[PDB]
Design a protein around this ligand. Structure first.
Ligand SMILES: [Cl-]
Ligand SMILES: [Cl-]
Lengths: 142, 142
């Protein structure tokens, strides 16, 4: 009932939107100023990233690189706001992420960092460990 | 296939996106800067406005108001680029627009103007006349 061309178009559009917001936030950080792009769009974007109809296309289109980039340090090396870090981990957790996606994305690297990062809340560190445990299970299960 | 929550979220998202681009282009025009938001997004936004899965929600959510907004004059009274005018008319004609929709949106007013505007191409006046004919037929059949 949604055409495969439409699912693809919307997945691509979401990808490009995550990239534009990332790049605008990073450029603002480099101008000594607040990045508000991600915080203003994370709920709505997270909601859509978790659409079960869209996930397979989003995953196949490398959406994990954008999620990754949103979890990464800004130019001044501060971290994205805690609501973003929490919400995007909650997105990775509910997505049907399998071995193929990890071996291709680098996301497991940023997530792993969160799990052992001493500046991170026990809550987030915990949730990143859970993700790590789950993804170890994907990668290695018979 | 797609949950009704997600359909409604994508429709609202597209609505606010058309509004934001319109207001940004209108504020650029008033400054003396070329308006490029609409031209850079009309193909992709058009493509999605024509999604059959989304149309009923988009229409119910008043998307005709935004389409109307994009067809009307900039602050200096010049018209949006011809590619936008042609593409949004093509969107209106393939979209399943009925009596209720017009009744509440004012888009029929902007289309009627295009049909009688002497500053407008023959092909554009023609397609707007066709739309008017079709909408007169919608409004009036038993
Ligand atoms: Cl941030
Ligand atoms: Cl324009």
């Amino acid at each position: 009932h949604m055409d495969p061309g439409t699912v693809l178009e919307i997945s691509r559009s979401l990808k490009k939107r995550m990239q534009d917001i990332l790049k605008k936030d990073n450029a603002n950080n480099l101008e000594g100023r607040p990045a508000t792009g991600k915080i203003e769009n994370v709920e709505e974007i997270s909601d859509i990233l978790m659409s079960k109809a869209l996930q397979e296309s989003l995953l196949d289109e490398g959406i994990l690189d954008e999620i990754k980039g949103w979890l990464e340090p800004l130019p001044d090396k501060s971290m994205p706001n805690i609501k973003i870090r929490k919400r995007l981990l909650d997105v990775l957790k509910t997505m049907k992420i399998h071995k193929e996606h990890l071996v291709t994305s680098g996301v497991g690297k940023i997530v792993y960092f969160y799990s052992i990062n001493p500046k991170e809340s026990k809550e987030v560190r915990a949730s990143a460990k859970a993700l790590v445990q789950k993804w170890t299970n994907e990668v290695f299960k018979p």
